[PDB]
Every structure is written in C-alpha cells, then in structure tokens.
C-alpha cells in the first residue's frame, strides 16, 4: 500500500509537468506563428514597395 | 518599409515635374523657332517686293 502510494504521487506529478510542458509549446508555437506572420507582411510589403517602384 | 515609400513618391514628383516642364519648354523652342522662320520669310518676300518696285 505504501508502495502504491507512492507511485501514484509520482504519476500525477509526472503528469501536471507534462500538462504544463504542453501548455508551454502551445505558447511558444504561438510565438513563432505571430513572428512568422511577421516576416510574410514586411517580404509582402517589400514586395509590394518593389512592384510599385518597378511599376512607378 | 515606410519612410523609403514616402522617398520613392518624392523622388518620382520630382521626376513628374522635371520631365513636364522639358517637354513644355520644348513645345516652347518648337513654337518660338517656327515664329522667327516664318518673320525670315516674309521678310524675304519684302525684299522681292522690293526689288520689283526698284524695276
């Protein structure tokens, strides 16, 4: 019984640490998403500063 | 980015500009120039005239 109780403390450490590791990469792959949108609006806008000089 | 955009406009004002009033100053030769050439020849047809009136 002791035994028993003490693995299932460890279980459920072992998963609130997992949850919060997920929690984690879900804000840090926000982060990238937001920051990859970064660079697809200013290559857009350099692109679009290139067509209108090209273009006057 | 932005400013450069704004450079861009700027530069093409001047661009607009520049090349209007070459155009309009050479309208201005090609006007000015057929005015002088048409005065040279009545003037010439006055000298006939004149030599006639001599005759």
Same mark, same amino acid.
């Given at each position: /019984?002791?035994?028993?109780?003490?693995?299932?403390?460890?279980?459920?450490?072992?998963?609130? /640490?997992?949850?919060?590791?997920?929690? /984690? #990469?879900?804000? =840090?792959?926000?982060?990238? $998403?937001?920051?990859?949108?970064? $660079?697809?609006?200013?290559?857009?806008? =350099?692109?679009?500063?290139?067509?209108?000089?090209? /273009? #006057? | 980015?932005?400013?450069? +955009?704004? +450079?861009?406009?700027?530069?093409?004002?001047?661009?607009?500009?520049?090349?209007?009033?070459?155009?309009?100053?050479?309208? @201005?030769?090609?006007?000015?120039? @057929?005015?002088? +050439?048409?005065?040279? @020849?009545?003037?010439?047809?006055?000298?006939? +005239?004149?030599?006639?009136?001599?005759?």
């Amino acid at each position: /019984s002791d035994k028993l109780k003490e693995a299932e403390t460890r279980a459920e450490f072992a998963e609130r /640490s997992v949850t919060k590791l997920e929690k /984690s #990469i879900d804000d =840090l792959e926000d982060e990238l $998403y937001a920051q990859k949108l970064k $660079y697809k609006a200013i290559s857009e806008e =350099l692109d679009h500063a290139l067509n209108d000089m090209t /273009s #006057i | 980015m932005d400013a450069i +955009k704004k +450079k861009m406009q700027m530069l093409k004002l001047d661009k607009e500009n520049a090349l209007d009033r070459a155009e309009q100053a050479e309208a @201005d030769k090609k006007a000015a120039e @057929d005015r002088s +050439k048409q005065l040279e @020849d009545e003037l010439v047809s006055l000298q006939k +005239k004149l030599k006639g009136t001599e005759d």
